């Protein structure tokens, strides 16, 4: 269970609340405590709710609660959200984004790899004879994948289906299973069988995760369907403290020619050297990431500075 702090600005407040609503609709958020100028005013507890329709309404109430306050925030005032959430797919829903990524990955996963022909394996049709195949076969050659929702809870889910006989036949006349080493001169229908995909029975949703060992297991000409197992465990009761202030946010790319120079940034604002020295000292130790003044995000070094004034 992690406790982390975050500071956000006023002109990006709609995005920050949007994110909290998105976590609520995934059933992760247990409570949200809203405070005006360090004064607790309201609390939202989502313990009993276990359906997307129920979570959507409590998501809307949060936006309606802090709409006029954040829209008219004055210099010196602040708003704080204390969010308690759980982690792990045995405690939250899959989002549609996460399911779409898994879908692409499953569609392109290799199910039958091309062999040398010196033993049993994949054979391809060459003018009536079975020769070494030109490519590997993938799951999307046999199955098609569908994203829908559960009729009990409303969470997004992922399921698979056998392709049509038309699509599968078009494949059966080109690739097949050779149960013995192919000499490249043996007839296709005689030296090759067609692969048989199994009927899918599992669905990816809460409490489940893709079992990459069982899924698409090859046993001769048989191919297993997408199989799921118990999801990995997560921690309970993480805290995220998100503050919203009325400050201008400015980003500088040090690796650019147009970026603000350290000289011109120092004429505008006034900085504390106890913090500037804290940053400099950390960047003289290893990679410079161990410590709270520098971090790596999306493959880049990031440092956040708050000037004392202008």
């Amino acid at each position: 269970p992690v406790t982390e702090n975050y500071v956000t600005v006023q002109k990006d407040w709609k995005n920050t609340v949007k994110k909290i609503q998105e976590a609520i609709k995934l059933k992760s958020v247990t409570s949200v405590e809203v405070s005006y100028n360090d004064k607790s005013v309201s609390t939202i507890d989502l313990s009993g709710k276990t359906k997307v329709s129920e979570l959507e309404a409590e998501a809307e109430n949060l936006y309606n609660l802090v709409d006029s306050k954040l829209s008219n925030l004055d210099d010196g005032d602040s708003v704080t959200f204390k969010v308690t959430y759980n982690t792990g797919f045995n405690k939250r829903f899959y989002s549609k984004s996460e399911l779409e990524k898994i879908k692409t990955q499953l569609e392109k996963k290799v199910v039958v790899a091309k062999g040398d022909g010196k033993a049993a394996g994949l054979a391809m049709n060459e003018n009536g004879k079975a020769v070494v195949a030109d490519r590997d076969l993938v799951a999307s050659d046999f199955y098609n994948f569908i994203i829908s929702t559960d009729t009990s809870t409303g969470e997004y889910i992922l399921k698979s289906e056998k392709k049509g006989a038309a699509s599968l036949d078009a494949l059966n006349e080109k690739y097949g299973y050779a149960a013995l080493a192919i000499d490249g001169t043996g007839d296709f229908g005689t030296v090759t069988e067609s692969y048989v995909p199994a009927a899918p029975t599992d669905i990816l949703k809460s409490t489940k995760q893709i079992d990459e060992t069982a899924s698409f297991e090859n046993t001769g000409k048989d191919i297993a369907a997408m199989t799921v197992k118990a999801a990995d465990p997560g921690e309970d009761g993480n805290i995220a403290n998100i503050k919203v202030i009325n400050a201008k946010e400015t980003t500088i790319d040090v690796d650019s020619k147009s970026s603000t120079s350290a000289e011109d940034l120092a004429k505008k604002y006034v900085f504390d050297d106890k913090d500037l020295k804290a940053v400099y000292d950390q960047l003289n130790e290893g990679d410079g990431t161990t410590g709270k003044y520098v971090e790596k995000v999306d493959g880049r070094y990031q440092v956040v500075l708050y000037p004392e004034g202008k």
Binding site: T251, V254, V270, L283, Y301, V304, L305
Partner: protein, 394 residues
């Protein structure tokens, strides 16, 4: 400042660890430069001393010398550098500012500043701890200034003699030879004495350590170096104290040096250069005064090449430079300090900066660079200021 009141949120992005560190280092340099390179000047010399007193005495400045009401004040004539030449160590030991007035009339600006630093207010009275010292005779500070101060209702003590040599003795007698040490300069060594005023004004306990609460200053004595000997009054004062002479042989000759050797029983030391600016540089190079690679703050003032009377700017600033970094305050009936002391020298230069001085600053400055640079008064060329900023990494 609190996060609810910060003006902005800066986010810095970089690919490589080096390019990020180099940006921060440059940011540090310009941040310190723009903050702590200040100029305390005003319209004339009289305003300049007032500007220094308002900023550093009885003030809420981040680098003030004292933030409590002052009990003493030292007054010098604005055109009498000869009289008040040794007045700086007195101001420093008495925890007082050094101010300038006109010879004839007590200027209204000085009248007001004395009230502010001393905390004189019509709602309360002047108690018996409120004294004002006068450095100079009646041809330096007239009787009118003396009597107008007395009508105000404070104590006035004129320290003066028949000439500059007697006057220096009166002032030095007031400072006190508490650590068996004194400085000697020649009657013509105006800038030479001004280069040692920041050193003399440092407060040190009996074991030679910095102590702004309990320490004592080091008196300065002016002698006539165009004689064959020293007079009795001078000889009586020095007793058996270690003597440091500031100036060349053409200011304090070898026979006066020998005279001090025999009268004291202790071989006198001497720091001297080829001209005014070289002697200034030599003071920086002497390890007894400023240890190598350990100075963080620097002051700049005019050298008086065109007119000697302009040395008063350094005269008023010397007590501040000797106590820079600490602040004199109270906590009940107990006096104490706030911070740590790091005395500063005064560089003397109006138009150009001698190469000797360049070596002086480079030796004295710490490896981490300069923290503060203060420009006292107007008239100094920006060429020397940029050169000083470069020398200090600022």
């Amino acid at each position: 400042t609190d996060i609810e009141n910060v003006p902005a949120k800066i986010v810095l992005k970089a690919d490589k660890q080096k390019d990020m560190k180099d940006y921060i280092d440059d940011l540090r340099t310009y941040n310190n430069s723009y903050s702590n390179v200040v100029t305390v000047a005003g319209e004339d010399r009289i305003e300049t001393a007032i500007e220094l007193s308002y900023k550093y005495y009885n003030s809420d400045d981040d680098n003030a010398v004292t933030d409590i009401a002052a009990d003493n004040v030292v007054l010098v004539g604005s055109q009498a550098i000869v009289d008040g030449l040794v007045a700086s160590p007195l101001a420093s030991e008495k925890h007082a500012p050094l101010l300038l007035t006109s010879k004839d009339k007590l200027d209204s600006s000085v009248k007001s500043e004395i009230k502010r630093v001393m905390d004189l207010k019509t709602t309360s009275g002047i108690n018996t701890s409120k004294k004002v010292y006068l450095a100079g005779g009646v041809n330096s500070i007239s009787k009118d200034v003396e009597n107008e101060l007395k009508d105000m209702g404070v104590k006035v003590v004129r320290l003066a003699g028949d000439d500059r040599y007697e006057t220096s003795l009166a002032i030095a007698d007031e400072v006190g030879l508490d650590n068996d040490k004194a400085f000697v300069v020649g009657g013509t060594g105006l800038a030479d004495a001004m280069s040692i005023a920041p050193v003399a004004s440092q407060l040190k306990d009996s074991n030679g350590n910095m102590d702004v609460v309990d320490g004592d200053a080091t008196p300065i004595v002016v002698v006539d170096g165009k004689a064959k000997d020293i007079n009795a009054a001078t000889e009586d004062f020095l007793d058996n104290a270690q003597v440091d002479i500031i100036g060349g042989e053409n200011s304090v000759s070898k026979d006066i040096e020998e005279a001090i050797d025999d009268a004291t029983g202790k071989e006198p030391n001497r720091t001297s250069g080829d001209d005014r600016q070289d002697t200034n540089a030599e003071v920086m190079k002497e390890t007894d005064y400023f240890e190598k690679a350990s100075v963080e703050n620097y002051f700049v003032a005019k050298d008086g090449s065109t007119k000697e009377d302009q040395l008063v700017d350094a005269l008023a600033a010397a007590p501040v430079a000797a106590n820079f970094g600490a602040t004199y305050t109270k906590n009940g009936s107990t006096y104490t300090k706030s911070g740590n002391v790091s005395p500063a020298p005064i560089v003397l230069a109006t138009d150009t900066l001698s190469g000797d001085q360049n070596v002086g600053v480079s030796k004295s400055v710490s490896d981490d660079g300069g923290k503060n640079l203060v420009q006292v008064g107007k008239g100094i060329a920006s060429s020397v200021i940029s050169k000083m900023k470069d020398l200090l990494d600022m």
